[PDB]
Amino acid sequence: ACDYTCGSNCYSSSDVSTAQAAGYKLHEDGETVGSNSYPHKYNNYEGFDFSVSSPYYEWPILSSGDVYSGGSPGADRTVFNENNQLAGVITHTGASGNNFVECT
Ligand SMILES: Nc1nc2c(ncn2[C@@H]2O[C@H](CO)[C@@H](O)[C@H]2OP(=O)(O)O)c(=O)[nH]1
Ligand SMILES: [Ca+2]
């Protein structure tokens, strides 16, 4: 079973932890990758009731299992905060336009 299901993509807790660790290290070093400059601030326009505190940052999580290093980011994202606490896993899949919905 999937710990997180983003549309058709299946992720385990270990998948999220690996992705999060990569994104947080780049955040701490002040570096970015990709055309959309990940990781970057996640403003939470959606108004998700996250249990951890702001500020939030989004970083792509890939269905291939590899860590994001540039190129197409896909539709899925891991959202973490300044303390490297996981806020949630979201996706553009099943959401209109550039909006997000939570992965179940
Ligand atoms: N939907 C959405 N997009 C956000 C949010 N915070 C930042 N963004 C960025 O705002 C722009 C319009 O949605 C996009 O560049 C999007 O970035 P990503 O596309 O990299 O997610 C947010 O809370 N919700
Ligand atoms: Ca996996």
Side-chain angles (χ1 to χ4, degrees), residues 1 21-22 26 57-58 76:
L26 286 183
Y57 299 92
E58 62 168 289
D76 314 330

Side-chain angles (χ1 to χ4, degrees), residues 66-92:
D66 299 321
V67 170
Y68 184 68
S69 59
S72 186
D76 314 330
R77 309 285 182 265
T78 57
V79 183
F80 60 85
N81 71 5
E82 208 59 64
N83 298 313
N84 197 191
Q85 298 181 105
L86 180 65
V89 188
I90 56 178
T91 184
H92 285 303

Side-chain angles (χ1 to χ4, degrees), residues 31-40 42-45:
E31 300 172 338
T32 57
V33 297
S35 293
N36 296 354
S37 295
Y38 293 109
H40 69 245
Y42 177 67
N43 301 114
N44 196 18
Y45 297 144

Side-chain angles (χ1 to χ4, degrees), residues 50-73:
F50 291 141
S51 71
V52 302
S53 58
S54 197
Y56 304 121
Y57 299 92
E58 62 168 289
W59 170 255
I61 180 168
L62 308 179
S63 59
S64 66
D66 299 321
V67 170
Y68 184 68
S69 59
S72 186

